[PDB]
Amino acid sequence: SVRGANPLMFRANVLHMLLEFVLDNLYLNRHTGFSQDHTPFTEGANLRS
Protein backbone atom coordinates (compact mmCIF):
# COMPACT_ATOMS: atom_id res chain seq x y z
CA SER A 1 0.00 0.00 0.00
CA VAL A 2 0.99 3.64 -0.27
CA ARG A 3 -1.73 5.27 1.89
CA GLY A 4 -1.35 3.11 5.00
CA ALA A 5 1.07 2.49 7.84
CA ASN A 6 1.55 -0.52 10.07
CA PRO A 7 0.00 0.21 13.50
CA LEU A 8 2.38 -2.31 15.07
CA MET A 9 5.34 0.08 14.70
CA PHE A 10 4.01 3.55 15.53
CA ARG A 11 6.36 3.74 18.51
CA ALA A 12 9.47 3.00 16.44
CA ASN A 13 8.39 5.54 13.83
CA VAL A 14 7.72 8.18 16.50
CA LEU A 15 11.09 7.56 18.13
CA HIS A 16 12.86 8.03 14.80
CA MET A 17 10.81 11.17 14.17
CA LEU A 18 11.82 12.62 17.53
CA LEU A 19 15.46 11.72 16.96
CA GLU A 20 15.42 13.64 13.68
CA PHE A 21 13.55 16.52 15.33
CA VAL A 22 16.43 16.78 17.80
CA LEU A 23 19.21 16.31 15.23
CA ASP A 24 17.78 19.03 13.01
CA ASN A 25 17.96 21.73 15.70
CA LEU A 26 21.63 21.30 16.65
CA TYR A 27 22.60 24.81 15.60
CA LEU A 28 24.07 27.79 17.43
CA ASN A 29 22.09 31.01 17.24
CA ARG A 30 23.85 33.85 15.44
CA HIS A 31 24.13 37.55 16.27
CA THR A 32 23.25 39.56 13.16
CA GLY A 33 22.39 43.19 13.90
CA PHE A 34 19.58 45.44 15.02
CA SER A 35 17.65 48.55 13.97
CA GLN A 36 16.30 51.24 16.29
CA ASP A 37 12.54 51.63 15.96
CA HIS A 38 10.23 54.61 16.35
CA THR A 39 6.84 53.10 15.48
CA PRO A 40 4.14 54.46 17.84
CA PHE A 41 3.81 51.01 19.46
CA THR A 42 7.49 49.98 19.70
CA GLU A 43 9.01 53.31 20.73
CA GLY A 44 12.80 53.19 20.77
CA ALA A 45 13.09 49.39 20.88
CA ASN A 46 16.03 47.82 19.06
CA LEU A 47 14.66 45.19 16.68
CA ARG A 48 16.69 42.41 15.08
CA SER A 49 16.89 42.38 11.29
Place this chain on the structure above:
Amino acid sequence: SVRGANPLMFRANVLHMLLEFVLDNLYLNRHTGFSQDHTPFTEGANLRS
Protein backbone atom coordinates in the same frame (compact mmCIF):
# COMPACT_ATOMS: atom_id res chain seq x y z
CA SER B 1 -4.39 -60.46 -12.09
CA VAL B 2 -3.07 -56.91 -11.93
CA ARG B 3 -5.65 -56.22 -9.21
CA GLY B 4 -5.01 -59.28 -7.05
CA ALA B 5 -2.61 -60.15 -4.26
CA ASN B 6 -1.87 -63.36 -2.40
CA PRO B 7 -3.28 -63.12 1.15
CA LEU B 8 -0.62 -65.42 2.61
CA MET B 9 2.08 -62.78 2.12
CA PHE B 10 0.54 -59.61 3.55
CA ARG B 11 2.83 -59.97 6.57
CA ALA B 12 6.03 -60.14 4.52
CA ASN B 13 4.89 -57.24 2.36
CA VAL B 14 4.00 -55.13 5.40
CA LEU B 15 7.35 -55.88 7.05
CA HIS B 16 9.13 -54.71 3.91
CA MET B 17 6.90 -51.63 3.80
CA LEU B 18 7.75 -50.71 7.38
CA LEU B 19 11.45 -51.24 6.70
CA GLU B 20 11.32 -48.91 3.70
CA PHE B 21 9.37 -46.37 5.76
CA VAL B 22 12.06 -46.29 8.43
CA LEU B 23 14.90 -46.28 5.89
CA ASP B 24 13.30 -43.31 4.16
CA ASN B 25 12.84 -41.25 7.30
CA LEU B 26 16.56 -41.24 8.28
CA TYR B 27 17.64 -37.62 7.91
CA LEU B 28 18.80 -34.79 10.14
CA ASN B 29 16.98 -31.48 10.55
CA ARG B 30 18.42 -28.28 9.09
CA HIS B 31 18.21 -24.87 10.72
CA THR B 32 16.97 -22.63 7.92
CA GLY B 33 16.18 -19.20 9.35
CA PHE B 34 13.27 -17.35 10.89
CA SER B 35 11.38 -14.07 10.55
CA GLN B 36 9.50 -11.80 12.95
CA ASP B 37 5.73 -11.66 12.49
CA HIS B 38 4.72 -8.19 11.30
CA THR B 39 0.97 -8.91 11.47
CA PRO B 40 -1.34 -9.20 14.51
CA PHE B 41 -2.29 -12.85 13.97
CA THR B 42 0.33 -14.02 16.48
CA GLU B 43 1.98 -12.28 19.42
CA GLY B 44 5.01 -11.36 17.34
CA ALA B 45 6.20 -14.95 17.01
CA ASN B 46 9.20 -16.05 14.96
CA LEU B 47 8.26 -18.09 11.89
CA ARG B 48 10.35 -20.42 9.75
CA SER B 49 10.96 -19.93 6.04
